[PDB]
RNA sequence: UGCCUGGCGGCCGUAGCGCGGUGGUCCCACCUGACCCCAUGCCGAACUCAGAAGUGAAACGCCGUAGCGCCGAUGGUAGUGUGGGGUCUCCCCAUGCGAGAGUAGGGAACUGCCAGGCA
RNA sequence: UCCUCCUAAAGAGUAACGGAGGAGCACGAAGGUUGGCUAAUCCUGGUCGGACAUCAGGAGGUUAGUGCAAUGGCAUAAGCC
RNA sequence: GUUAUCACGGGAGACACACGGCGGGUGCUAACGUCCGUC
């Protein structure tokens, strides 16, 4: 709400002006956000998975859900039905506030800030990257940090092309590649 | 898609009722409007039908779509079926979830004098 | 410029085909357009001599049947598996 | 032992209630009207009438039906 | 009753797939939270409540494209039931049933009932 | 002893000391009901990753799985919650 | 077509078939070797 109002006030206007769209909702509309943890070392120990899930729940407004094995391979010695990681599916006020808090401080402050990639898209305009050093986030404090860990962040949107993703990045002002 | 999933879910009871071969009352629901009909065993003829979009039954309803509207539609369908002589139809909720307007209209039809 | 001759087809079936092949002849068919397809009878040695030419692959055949001249083109020629005999030809009224 | 397989009764022939039409290893045929499928994937009649075969469905699967005389 | 939309059946690649166009008159679809109807292997994940605040946009109805794909003759060919012959590993003679494949052709399907809208 | 494909010739049955194989198991859940979901494989991004832990998106549409050797079937699922 | 069809009662015989024709399997797509379904 707090960020959605501004998004509709300014982002939609500029997007429509630049893309000469006709339908009011032709502008891209965010569907959801996904924050997943796919470290894969959960086989060695199971407590780290629970600790990371609790940390994700604390930083977000809802608890993550665990994901079971998809397909087993003899090379990596992984069975079926054994949980490895978990994901948080942010929708609504929770996703809005989480994304606002991220973009406010977290993204600017990161070591080796080379810049996000505007071309690394799945193919239909869904931006799904991975970020390490979870300490960058403000919620994760040294009193609870356990080990340098990474996560996968995706913004699922109704768009079906990379041009819409580029326009969304431009609206977010896209500091630099 | 939502309509395809709903149709596939309803297909279970739709095919199961073919073996029974008895007239069945079905209701399609939408936040805007609600439709209802009583299909014959052949599956191609309906003995009675109604729709919330129709003013003839929406005159006393504040709007076509609401719990009171669904209850009134169910009561009207039950009364019309009883006066026509449907002879103990079966029920099918078109693959919906039996907790809201569908439940209200089913209860209304049951209390109208039906035995399904 | 190429002379051709044909005979009316009045028989039908594998029996007729065997009769023709025993009598040293074989049938052919002409199809295409709105006119109904029709079967015609041709001999064997003369047809082989005609086909010996290398221009048949692009020449328009002038069939002479029942005192009528018809311009056609051969598209399919069913040839015997190994023996040097022909048993069926297909023409289109181009 | 050689397990018995095949179509016990063909189309256009009369069958009574509970009569098996075809005892198939799998489900090469599907019951239609007045035909039921047992636990052994066997099609059995439920009424008295003539048997018939038909082909339909997205995969052109075969159906066995019964029409009362 | 001319046209559009949704549901209830038939048929099951002529209804299938790719591309362009069009659509809010009705209908359909996107939307907030939900302590309340309903409940989540967390999530309103699926389904429900206030309707248009706004639109025809994923999707969805329809038209063109015969592009991919599908159905498909007559005839011919392989095969085969009966009687006989030959140089009897196989072929032919008289006769009946007839392939697959391919060509012409077909077609962007069609049909019965209910409901709403522009007339 | 039982069971699976040919032989066994477009109905069924159909043999040689013919050519090819598994079993003497197994549940108080791996059964039933009801409410739901739906496959291997490749591609994009991916400190751990070597192509081959899993992860967000696309194609695929049962070549997966369907406890055993094998055969017929299973998407409406007979596969899973 | 003389009911040439089926059903019950009593009496049987055999319970070691060869050759040829038609479509096949084993055999080395060596066969006229060998075993099958039918006349």
Author numbering:
A (entry chain F): 1 to 177
B (entry chain O): 2 to 117
C (entry chain V): 1 to 94
D (entry chain W): 13 to 81
Question: What does the published report state?
Answer:
The proline-rich antimicrobial designer peptide Api137 inhibits protein expression in bacteria by binding simultaneously to the ribosomal polypeptide exit tunnel and the release factor (RF), depleting the cellular RF pool and leading to ribosomal arrest at stop codons. High-resolution structures obtained by cryogenic electron microscopy demonstrate that a large proportion of pre-50S states are missing up to five proteins (uL22, bL32, uL29, bL23, and uL16) and have misfolded helices in 23S rRNA domain IV. These data suggest a second mechanism for Api137, wherein it disrupts 50S subunit assembly by inducing the formation of misfolded precursor particles potentially incapable of evolving into active ribosomes, suggesting a bactericidal mechanism.
Based on these structural distinctions, we categorized the 11 Api137 specific states into four groups representing different stages of maturation, five of which lacked cryo-EM density for the CP, while six had docked the 5S rRNA, with the CP accordingly formed. Importantly, the absence of uL22 was consistently observed in most identified precursors (states: 1-8), implying a systematic effect of Api137 on ribosome assembly. The absence of uL22 and bL32 in several states of the Api137 dataset also led to the absence of uL2 in eight precursor states (states 1-8), suggesting a possible role of uL2 as a checkpoint protein, whose binding completes a construction phase.
